[PDB]
Write an enzyme that holds these catalytic residues in place. Structure first.
Site, mmCIF file in Angstrom:
data_model
loop_
_atom_site.group_PDB
_atom_site.id
_atom_site.type_symbol
_atom_site.label_atom_id
_atom_site.label_comp_id
_atom_site.label_asym_id
_atom_site.label_seq_id
_atom_site.Cartn_x
_atom_site.Cartn_y
_atom_site.Cartn_z
ATOM 1 C CG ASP A 194 -1.801 1.223 1.314
ATOM 2 O OD1 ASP A 194 -1.632 2.202 0.536
ATOM 3 O OD2 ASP A 194 -2.697 1.192 2.171
ATOM 4 C CG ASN B 145 -0.882 3.046 -13.603
ATOM 5 O OD1 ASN B 145 -1.538 3.741 -14.394
ATOM 6 N ND2 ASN B 145 -1.298 1.853 -13.173
ATOM 7 C CE1 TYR C 126 -8.608 8.764 -11.425
ATOM 8 C CE2 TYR C 126 -9.596 10.104 -13.163
ATOM 9 C CZ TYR C 126 -8.726 9.113 -12.769
ATOM 10 O OH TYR C 126 -7.998 8.491 -13.750
ATOM 11 C CE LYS D 138 -5.300 10.187 -12.349
ATOM 12 N NZ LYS D 138 -4.009 9.443 -12.169
ATOM 13 C CB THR E 231 -8.433 -2.102 -18.005
ATOM 14 O OG1 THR E 231 -9.097 -1.100 -17.220
ATOM 15 C CG2 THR E 231 -7.327 -1.442 -18.838
#
Lengths: 241, 241
Positions: free
Chosen positions: B61, B84, B146, B150, B181
Protein backbone atom coordinates in the site's frame (compact mmCIF):
# COMPACT_ATOMS: atom_id res chain seq x y z
CA UNK A 1 19.22 2.42 -31.56
CA UNK A 2 15.69 3.30 -30.31
CA UNK A 3 13.44 1.81 -33.03
CA UNK A 4 13.70 -1.56 -34.85
CA UNK A 5 15.54 -1.08 -38.13
CA UNK A 6 12.81 -1.76 -40.70
CA UNK A 7 9.62 -0.70 -38.95
CA UNK A 8 8.76 1.49 -41.99
CA UNK A 9 10.02 -0.96 -44.64
CA UNK A 10 7.90 -0.80 -47.79
CA UNK A 11 6.23 2.45 -46.77
CA UNK A 12 6.33 5.89 -48.39
CA UNK A 13 6.78 9.15 -46.46
CA UNK A 14 6.59 12.73 -47.78
CA UNK A 15 8.19 15.59 -45.83
CA UNK A 16 7.46 19.21 -46.79
CA UNK A 17 10.23 21.63 -45.85
CA UNK A 18 12.49 18.60 -46.13
CA UNK A 19 15.63 20.19 -47.48
CA UNK A 20 17.16 21.45 -44.20
CA UNK A 21 16.82 21.63 -40.43
CA UNK A 22 14.02 19.72 -38.73
CA UNK A 23 12.58 18.53 -42.05
CA UNK A 24 15.89 17.03 -43.19
CA UNK A 25 16.31 15.29 -39.82
CA UNK A 26 12.79 13.86 -40.06
CA UNK A 27 13.43 12.63 -43.63
CA UNK A 28 16.67 10.94 -42.54
CA UNK A 29 15.03 9.29 -39.54
CA UNK A 30 12.21 7.69 -41.57
CA UNK A 31 14.69 6.60 -44.31
CA UNK A 32 16.94 4.96 -41.68
CA UNK A 33 13.89 2.95 -40.46
CA UNK A 34 13.26 1.57 -43.97
CA UNK A 35 10.87 4.11 -45.51
CA UNK A 36 11.12 5.53 -48.99
CA UNK A 37 10.98 9.32 -48.45
CA UNK A 38 10.28 12.25 -50.71
CA UNK A 39 11.85 15.41 -49.25
CA UNK A 40 10.29 18.54 -50.75
CA UNK A 41 11.58 22.06 -50.47
CA UNK A 42 13.77 24.85 -51.78
CA UNK A 43 17.51 24.31 -52.29
CA UNK A 44 16.86 20.56 -52.58
CA UNK A 45 20.54 19.72 -53.28
CA UNK A 46 21.98 22.21 -50.78
CA UNK A 47 24.55 21.47 -48.09
CA UNK A 48 21.92 20.56 -45.46
CA UNK A 49 19.71 18.38 -47.64
CA UNK A 50 19.13 14.83 -46.42
CA UNK A 51 21.28 12.40 -48.46
CA UNK A 52 20.31 8.72 -48.33
CA UNK A 53 19.60 6.04 -50.92
CA UNK A 54 15.92 5.96 -49.85
CA UNK A 55 15.42 9.75 -49.97
CA UNK A 56 14.34 11.39 -53.23
CA UNK A 57 14.95 15.15 -53.01
CA UNK A 58 12.55 17.35 -54.93
CA UNK A 59 12.82 21.07 -55.65
CA UNK A 60 9.31 22.43 -55.19
CA UNK A 61 7.69 25.60 -53.88
CA UNK A 62 4.70 24.11 -52.05
CA UNK A 63 2.72 27.38 -52.42
CA UNK A 64 2.58 26.49 -56.13
CA UNK A 65 -0.66 24.57 -55.61
CA UNK A 66 -0.96 23.06 -59.10
CA UNK A 67 2.60 21.75 -59.00
CA UNK A 68 2.00 20.21 -55.55
CA UNK A 69 -1.13 18.48 -56.84
CA UNK A 70 0.75 16.89 -59.78
CA UNK A 71 3.39 15.56 -57.44
CA UNK A 72 0.77 13.89 -55.24
CA UNK A 73 -1.08 12.48 -58.25
CA UNK A 74 2.21 10.83 -59.37
CA UNK A 75 2.73 8.97 -56.06
CA UNK A 76 1.73 5.31 -56.15
CA UNK A 77 1.40 5.20 -52.35
CA UNK A 78 1.70 7.33 -49.24
CA UNK A 79 1.67 6.18 -45.63
CA UNK A 80 2.94 9.31 -43.78
CA UNK A 81 2.75 13.04 -44.56
CA UNK A 82 4.88 15.43 -42.52
CA UNK A 83 3.90 19.11 -42.88
CA UNK A 84 7.13 20.73 -41.70
CA UNK A 85 7.32 23.64 -44.14
CA UNK A 86 7.21 26.95 -42.32
CA UNK A 87 8.70 30.45 -42.47
CA UNK A 88 8.75 33.65 -40.47
CA UNK A 89 9.57 37.17 -41.63
CA UNK A 90 9.79 38.45 -38.05
CA UNK A 91 8.65 42.07 -37.70
CA UNK A 92 7.92 42.37 -41.45
CA UNK A 93 4.84 40.26 -40.55
CA UNK A 94 3.14 43.49 -39.41
CA UNK A 95 2.72 44.28 -43.12
CA UNK A 96 -0.48 42.54 -44.30
CA UNK A 97 0.94 41.11 -47.55
CA UNK A 98 3.79 39.56 -45.55
CA UNK A 99 1.38 38.33 -42.85
CA UNK A 100 -0.65 36.54 -45.57
CA UNK A 101 2.45 35.10 -47.22
CA UNK A 102 3.47 33.49 -43.91
CA UNK A 103 -0.07 32.09 -43.40
CA UNK A 104 -0.13 30.74 -46.97
CA UNK A 105 3.04 28.72 -46.50
CA UNK A 106 2.56 27.66 -42.86
CA UNK A 107 -1.19 26.95 -42.91
CA UNK A 108 -2.69 26.84 -46.42
CA UNK A 109 0.03 24.60 -47.83
CA UNK A 110 -0.43 22.15 -44.95
CA UNK A 111 -4.21 22.11 -45.53
CA UNK A 112 -3.67 21.45 -49.26
CA UNK A 113 -0.99 18.80 -48.71
CA UNK A 114 -3.25 17.03 -46.19
CA UNK A 115 -6.19 16.95 -48.63
CA UNK A 116 -3.96 15.79 -51.49
CA UNK A 117 -2.47 13.07 -49.26
CA UNK A 118 -5.84 11.98 -47.90
CA UNK A 119 -6.92 9.45 -50.61
CA UNK A 120 -3.50 7.74 -50.54
CA UNK A 121 -3.39 7.71 -46.73
CA UNK A 122 -6.92 6.23 -46.71
CA UNK A 123 -5.89 3.16 -48.82
CA UNK A 124 -4.32 1.30 -45.83
CA UNK A 125 -4.60 4.00 -43.19
CA UNK A 126 -1.63 6.14 -42.21
CA UNK A 127 -0.78 9.40 -40.50
CA UNK A 128 -0.16 13.10 -40.77
CA UNK A 129 2.33 14.96 -38.60
CA UNK A 130 2.22 18.77 -38.41
CA UNK A 131 4.92 21.01 -36.81
CA UNK A 132 3.67 23.54 -34.22
CA UNK A 133 5.83 25.79 -31.97
CA UNK A 134 6.30 27.37 -28.56
CA UNK A 135 4.35 30.20 -30.30
CA UNK A 136 1.23 27.95 -30.50
CA UNK A 137 1.04 28.75 -26.74
CA UNK A 138 3.01 31.92 -26.08
CA UNK A 139 2.41 35.00 -28.20
CA UNK A 140 5.27 36.56 -30.21
CA UNK A 141 5.39 40.38 -30.49
CA UNK A 142 8.17 39.97 -33.12
CA UNK A 143 6.30 37.46 -35.33
CA UNK A 144 2.51 37.77 -35.06
CA UNK A 145 1.92 35.89 -38.33
CA UNK A 146 4.12 33.01 -37.31
CA UNK A 147 2.36 32.75 -33.93
CA UNK A 148 -1.11 33.02 -35.56
CA UNK A 149 -0.11 30.36 -38.07
CA UNK A 150 1.03 27.99 -35.33
CA UNK A 151 -2.18 28.43 -33.34
CA UNK A 152 -4.00 27.68 -36.59
CA UNK A 153 -1.92 24.54 -37.21
CA UNK A 154 -2.85 23.10 -33.76
CA UNK A 155 -6.58 23.59 -34.48
CA UNK A 156 -6.20 22.20 -37.98
CA UNK A 157 -4.48 19.18 -36.41
CA UNK A 158 -7.48 18.70 -34.08
CA UNK A 159 -10.04 19.27 -36.85
CA UNK A 160 -8.50 16.92 -39.36
CA UNK A 161 -8.00 14.29 -36.62
CA UNK A 162 -11.81 14.32 -36.23
CA UNK A 163 -12.48 14.37 -40.01
CA UNK A 164 -9.93 11.77 -41.12
CA UNK A 165 -10.36 9.20 -38.31
CA UNK A 166 -13.01 7.19 -40.24
CA UNK A 167 -10.37 6.62 -42.96
CA UNK A 168 -7.91 5.29 -40.34
CA UNK A 169 -5.71 8.38 -40.69
CA UNK A 170 -4.24 9.78 -37.46
CA UNK A 171 -3.25 13.46 -37.35
CA UNK A 172 -0.86 14.79 -34.72
CA UNK A 173 1.57 17.66 -34.15
CA UNK A 174 4.92 18.31 -32.50
CA UNK A 175 5.55 21.66 -30.78
CA UNK A 176 9.33 21.98 -30.89
CA UNK A 177 11.09 24.30 -28.43
CA UNK A 178 14.30 26.16 -29.30
CA UNK A 179 15.98 23.93 -31.77
CA UNK A 180 19.50 24.85 -32.83
CA UNK A 181 19.38 24.89 -36.66
CA UNK A 182 21.33 26.87 -39.31
CA UNK A 183 17.87 28.39 -40.05
CA UNK A 184 18.31 30.50 -36.87
CA UNK A 185 22.07 30.62 -36.16
CA UNK A 186 21.66 34.41 -35.70
CA UNK A 187 19.50 33.90 -32.57
CA UNK A 188 22.66 32.49 -30.92
CA UNK A 189 24.57 35.61 -32.05
CA UNK A 190 22.07 37.42 -29.77
CA UNK A 191 23.59 36.78 -26.32
CA UNK A 192 20.61 38.22 -24.47
CA UNK A 193 17.99 36.09 -26.18
CA UNK A 194 20.13 33.00 -25.65
CA UNK A 195 20.62 33.67 -21.95
CA UNK A 196 16.87 34.23 -21.56
CA UNK A 197 15.98 31.04 -23.37
CA UNK A 198 18.48 28.96 -21.45
CA UNK A 199 17.28 30.42 -18.16
CA UNK A 200 13.71 29.30 -18.99
CA UNK A 201 14.69 25.87 -20.30
CA UNK A 202 14.89 23.25 -17.53
CA UNK A 203 17.27 21.14 -19.64
CA UNK A 204 19.40 24.30 -20.07
CA UNK A 205 20.49 23.57 -23.67
CA UNK A 206 19.27 23.88 -27.25
CA UNK A 207 17.16 21.15 -28.66
CA UNK A 208 18.41 19.50 -31.85
CA UNK A 209 16.68 18.36 -35.05
CA UNK A 210 17.18 14.62 -34.49
CA UNK A 211 15.32 14.92 -31.19
CA UNK A 212 12.25 16.22 -33.03
CA UNK A 213 12.80 13.44 -35.63
CA UNK A 214 12.75 10.63 -33.07
CA UNK A 215 9.38 11.89 -31.71
CA UNK A 216 8.11 12.00 -35.37
CA UNK A 217 9.07 8.36 -35.92
CA UNK A 218 7.12 7.36 -32.82
CA UNK A 219 3.96 9.37 -33.48
CA UNK A 220 3.68 8.15 -37.09
CA UNK A 221 4.08 4.43 -36.23
CA UNK A 222 2.12 1.50 -34.73
CA UNK A 223 3.25 2.32 -31.19
CA UNK A 224 1.00 5.42 -31.49
CA UNK A 225 -2.10 3.56 -32.78
CA UNK A 226 -4.44 5.31 -30.29
CA UNK A 227 -2.77 8.72 -30.63
CA UNK A 228 -4.66 11.25 -32.72
CA UNK A 229 -5.29 14.99 -32.44
CA UNK A 230 -2.35 15.21 -30.02
CA UNK A 231 0.31 17.87 -29.70
CA UNK A 232 3.60 16.66 -28.20
CA UNK A 233 5.94 19.33 -26.82
CA UNK A 234 9.62 18.63 -27.56
CA UNK A 235 11.03 21.65 -25.78
CA UNK A 236 13.36 20.74 -22.88
CA UNK A 237 10.67 21.90 -20.45
CA UNK A 238 10.46 25.48 -21.75
CA UNK A 239 6.62 25.55 -21.59
CA UNK A 240 6.82 24.69 -17.84
CA UNK A 241 9.11 27.44 -16.53
CA UNK B 1 7.69 -4.72 -32.36
CA UNK B 2 8.38 -0.96 -32.56
CA UNK B 3 11.37 -0.53 -30.21
CA UNK B 4 14.79 -2.22 -30.35
CA UNK B 5 14.36 -5.34 -28.21
CA UNK B 6 16.83 -4.61 -25.44
CA UNK B 7 16.60 -0.80 -25.30
CA UNK B 8 16.14 -1.06 -21.51
CA UNK B 9 18.55 -3.97 -20.94
CA UNK B 10 20.40 -3.54 -17.65
CA UNK B 11 17.94 -0.93 -16.36
CA UNK B 12 15.52 -1.04 -13.41
CA UNK B 13 11.89 0.19 -13.63
CA UNK B 14 9.32 0.58 -10.85
CA UNK B 15 5.59 0.76 -11.57
CA UNK B 16 3.13 1.78 -8.85
CA UNK B 17 -0.39 0.49 -9.41
CA UNK B 18 1.27 -2.34 -11.32
CA UNK B 19 -1.07 -5.18 -10.38
CA UNK B 20 -3.77 -4.68 -13.00
CA UNK B 21 -4.75 -2.78 -16.19
CA UNK B 22 -2.53 -0.03 -17.59
CA UNK B 23 0.04 -0.59 -14.85
CA UNK B 24 0.40 -4.28 -15.69
CA UNK B 25 0.73 -3.51 -19.43
CA UNK B 26 3.41 -0.85 -18.64
CA UNK B 27 5.39 -3.30 -16.48
CA UNK B 28 5.18 -5.91 -19.22
CA UNK B 29 6.27 -3.45 -21.97
CA UNK B 30 9.45 -2.45 -20.07
CA UNK B 31 10.22 -6.13 -19.17
CA UNK B 32 9.88 -7.17 -22.83
CA UNK B 33 12.41 -4.44 -23.74
CA UNK B 34 14.99 -5.87 -21.33
CA UNK B 35 14.30 -4.01 -18.09
CA UNK B 36 14.02 -5.55 -14.66
CA UNK B 37 10.66 -4.30 -13.22
CA UNK B 38 9.18 -4.02 -9.75
CA UNK B 39 5.37 -3.96 -9.97
CA UNK B 40 3.73 -2.62 -6.80
CA UNK B 41 0.10 -2.74 -5.78
CA UNK B 42 -2.75 -4.45 -3.96
CA UNK B 43 -3.75 -7.99 -4.91
CA UNK B 44 -0.21 -8.46 -6.30
CA UNK B 45 -0.82 -12.14 -7.20
CA UNK B 46 -4.36 -11.63 -8.50
CA UNK B 47 -5.66 -12.85 -11.86
CA UNK B 48 -4.74 -9.56 -13.66
CA UNK B 49 -1.23 -9.20 -12.20
CA UNK B 50 1.65 -9.12 -14.71
CA UNK B 51 3.43 -12.52 -14.70
CA UNK B 52 7.02 -12.49 -16.15
CA UNK B 53 10.44 -13.69 -14.90
CA UNK B 54 11.75 -10.06 -15.12
CA UNK B 55 8.82 -8.65 -13.09
CA UNK B 56 8.93 -8.84 -9.29
CA UNK B 57 5.40 -8.37 -7.89
CA UNK B 58 5.20 -6.68 -4.51
CA UNK B 59 2.14 -6.31 -2.26
CA UNK B 60 2.39 -2.77 -0.96
CA UNK B 61 0.00 0.00 0.00
CA UNK B 62 1.95 2.99 -1.28
CA UNK B 63 0.18 5.33 1.19
CA UNK B 64 2.20 3.45 3.86
CA UNK B 65 5.06 5.92 3.60
CA UNK B 66 7.62 4.11 5.79
CA UNK B 67 7.18 0.83 3.91
CA UNK B 68 7.57 2.65 0.58
CA UNK B 69 10.81 4.24 1.79
CA UNK B 70 12.33 0.88 2.76
CA UNK B 71 11.53 -0.58 -0.63
CA UNK B 72 13.27 2.31 -2.41
CA UNK B 73 16.28 2.11 -0.05
CA UNK B 74 16.66 -1.59 -0.93
CA UNK B 75 16.94 -0.92 -4.70
CA UNK B 76 20.53 -0.83 -5.98
CA UNK B 77 19.45 1.21 -8.99
CA UNK B 78 16.44 2.83 -10.59
CA UNK B 79 16.21 4.29 -14.06
CA UNK B 80 12.44 4.79 -14.52
CA UNK B 81 9.56 5.46 -12.08
CA UNK B 82 5.98 5.13 -13.33
CA UNK B 83 3.39 6.68 -10.98
CA UNK B 84 0.31 4.81 -12.24
CA UNK B 85 -1.39 4.19 -8.88
CA UNK B 86 -4.73 5.98 -8.84
CA UNK B 87 -8.28 5.44 -7.66
CA UNK B 88 -11.71 7.06 -7.90
CA UNK B 89 -14.69 6.62 -5.55
CA UNK B 90 -17.06 8.39 -7.96
CA UNK B 91 -19.83 10.34 -6.20
CA UNK B 92 -18.58 9.31 -2.74
CA UNK B 93 -15.82 11.88 -3.48
CA UNK B 94 -18.29 14.61 -2.37
CA UNK B 95 -17.61 13.36 1.19
CA UNK B 96 -14.48 15.16 2.44
CA UNK B 97 -12.76 12.12 4.01
CA UNK B 98 -13.18 10.26 0.70
CA UNK B 99 -12.05 13.31 -1.30
CA UNK B 100 -8.84 13.41 0.76
CA UNK B 101 -8.29 9.65 0.44
CA UNK B 102 -8.37 9.94 -3.36
CA UNK B 103 -5.96 12.89 -3.30
CA UNK B 104 -3.62 11.01 -0.95
CA UNK B 105 -3.28 8.06 -3.27
CA UNK B 106 -3.37 9.86 -6.63
CA UNK B 107 -1.23 12.90 -5.73
CA UNK B 108 0.60 12.60 -2.40
CA UNK B 109 1.81 9.04 -3.07
CA UNK B 110 3.15 10.15 -6.48
CA UNK B 111 4.97 13.07 -4.84
CA UNK B 112 6.50 10.73 -2.25
CA UNK B 113 7.47 8.07 -4.77
CA UNK B 114 9.12 10.73 -6.94
CA UNK B 115 11.14 12.09 -4.03
CA UNK B 116 12.18 8.60 -2.91
CA UNK B 117 13.14 7.69 -6.49
CA UNK B 118 15.01 10.94 -7.04
CA UNK B 119 18.50 10.00 -5.65
CA UNK B 120 18.56 6.75 -7.65
CA UNK B 121 17.28 8.39 -10.81
CA UNK B 122 19.92 11.11 -10.43
CA UNK B 123 22.91 8.72 -10.48
CA UNK B 124 22.92 8.28 -14.28
CA UNK B 125 19.80 10.27 -15.06
CA UNK B 126 16.46 8.70 -15.83
CA UNK B 127 12.78 9.52 -16.01
CA UNK B 128 9.46 9.70 -14.25
CA UNK B 129 6.16 9.05 -15.95
CA UNK B 130 2.89 10.15 -14.32
CA UNK B 131 -0.64 9.15 -15.47
CA UNK B 132 -3.06 12.01 -16.08
CA UNK B 133 -6.61 11.72 -17.50
CA UNK B 134 -9.23 13.23 -19.75
CA UNK B 135 -10.31 14.75 -16.39
CA UNK B 136 -7.09 16.80 -16.28
CA UNK B 137 -8.90 18.90 -18.95
CA UNK B 138 -12.63 18.21 -18.65
CA UNK B 139 -14.29 18.45 -15.26
CA UNK B 140 -16.17 15.48 -13.81
CA UNK B 141 -19.39 16.06 -11.84
CA UNK B 142 -19.27 12.38 -10.80
CA UNK B 143 -15.69 12.38 -9.54
CA UNK B 144 -14.54 15.81 -8.37
CA UNK B 145 -11.63 14.47 -6.31
CA UNK B 146 -10.38 12.33 -9.19
CA UNK B 147 -10.52 15.30 -11.54
CA UNK B 148 -8.85 17.62 -9.01
CA UNK B 149 -6.14 15.01 -8.45
CA UNK B 150 -5.46 14.68 -12.17
CA UNK B 151 -5.19 18.46 -12.63
CA UNK B 152 -2.77 18.35 -9.71
CA UNK B 153 -0.75 15.55 -11.32
CA UNK B 154 -0.21 17.65 -14.47
CA UNK B 155 1.11 20.60 -12.45
CA UNK B 156 3.26 18.26 -10.33
CA UNK B 157 4.66 16.84 -13.58
CA UNK B 158 5.53 20.35 -14.75
CA UNK B 159 6.96 21.39 -11.35
CA UNK B 160 9.19 18.37 -10.89
CA UNK B 161 10.32 18.61 -14.51
CA UNK B 162 11.70 22.04 -13.61
CA UNK B 163 13.21 20.87 -10.31
CA UNK B 164 14.70 17.58 -11.42
CA UNK B 165 16.20 18.70 -14.79
CA UNK B 166 19.64 19.51 -13.26
CA UNK B 167 19.84 15.82 -12.21
CA UNK B 168 19.08 14.66 -15.77
CA UNK B 169 15.68 13.34 -14.71
CA UNK B 170 12.87 14.00 -17.21
CA UNK B 171 9.30 14.06 -15.89
CA UNK B 172 6.35 13.53 -18.24
CA UNK B 173 2.73 12.34 -18.22
CA UNK B 174 0.33 10.37 -20.39
CA UNK B 175 -3.34 11.41 -20.45
CA UNK B 176 -5.08 8.21 -21.39
CA UNK B 177 -8.57 8.34 -22.89
CA UNK B 178 -11.08 5.53 -22.32
CA UNK B 179 -9.07 2.35 -21.98
CA UNK B 180 -10.81 -1.03 -21.98
CA UNK B 181 -9.45 -2.83 -18.91
CA UNK B 182 -11.08 -5.40 -16.62
CA UNK B 183 -10.62 -2.64 -13.96
CA UNK B 184 -13.64 -0.84 -15.51
CA UNK B 185 -15.62 -3.56 -17.32
CA UNK B 186 -18.76 -2.16 -15.62
CA UNK B 187 -18.54 1.12 -17.61
CA UNK B 188 -19.21 -1.00 -20.74
CA UNK B 189 -22.19 -2.58 -18.96
CA UNK B 190 -23.54 0.99 -19.07
CA UNK B 191 -24.79 1.24 -22.70
CA UNK B 192 -25.55 4.95 -22.39
CA UNK B 193 -22.16 6.09 -21.10
CA UNK B 194 -20.50 3.94 -23.77
CA UNK B 195 -22.59 5.50 -26.55
CA UNK B 196 -21.72 9.00 -25.29
CA UNK B 197 -18.01 8.21 -25.12
CA UNK B 198 -17.95 6.57 -28.55
CA UNK B 199 -19.80 9.49 -30.07
CA UNK B 200 -16.98 11.79 -28.80
CA UNK B 201 -14.10 9.48 -29.82
CA UNK B 202 -12.85 10.02 -33.40
CA UNK B 203 -11.25 6.56 -33.53
CA UNK B 204 -14.66 5.19 -32.43
CA UNK B 205 -13.29 2.50 -30.11
CA UNK B 206 -11.86 1.83 -26.69
CA UNK B 207 -8.16 2.19 -26.20
CA UNK B 208 -6.15 -0.90 -25.12
CA UNK B 209 -3.62 -1.01 -22.26
CA UNK B 210 -0.62 -1.87 -24.49
CA UNK B 211 -1.27 1.30 -26.51
CA UNK B 212 -0.67 3.38 -23.36
CA UNK B 213 2.36 1.20 -22.59
CA UNK B 214 4.03 1.82 -25.96
CA UNK B 215 3.75 5.56 -25.34
CA UNK B 216 5.37 4.99 -21.89
CA UNK B 217 8.27 3.10 -23.52
CA UNK B 218 8.87 6.06 -25.85
CA UNK B 219 8.66 8.86 -23.28
CA UNK B 220 10.99 7.11 -20.84
CA UNK B 221 13.72 6.38 -23.44
CA UNK B 222 16.46 8.15 -25.49
CA UNK B 223 14.10 9.00 -28.35
CA UNK B 224 12.48 11.45 -25.90
CA UNK B 225 15.75 13.10 -24.79
CA UNK B 226 14.40 16.66 -25.21
CA UNK B 227 10.95 15.80 -23.81
CA UNK B 228 10.29 16.91 -20.26
CA UNK B 229 7.27 18.45 -18.55
CA UNK B 230 5.08 17.13 -21.38
CA UNK B 231 1.64 15.55 -21.35
CA UNK B 232 0.89 13.16 -24.24
CA UNK B 233 -2.75 12.37 -24.92
CA UNK B 234 -3.38 8.70 -25.80
CA UNK B 235 -7.12 9.02 -26.26
CA UNK B 236 -8.30 8.22 -29.79
CA UNK B 237 -8.99 11.92 -30.33
CA UNK B 238 -11.44 12.34 -27.46
CA UNK B 239 -9.97 15.69 -26.37
CA UNK B 240 -10.70 17.08 -29.87
CA UNK B 241 -14.38 16.23 -30.24
Amino acid sequence: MVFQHDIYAGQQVLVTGGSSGIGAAIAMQFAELGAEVVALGLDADGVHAPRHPRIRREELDITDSQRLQRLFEALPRLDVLVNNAGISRDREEYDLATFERVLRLNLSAAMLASQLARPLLAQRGGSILNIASMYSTFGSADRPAYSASKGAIVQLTRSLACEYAAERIRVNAIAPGWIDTPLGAGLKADVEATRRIMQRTPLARWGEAPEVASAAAFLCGPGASFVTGAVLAVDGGYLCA
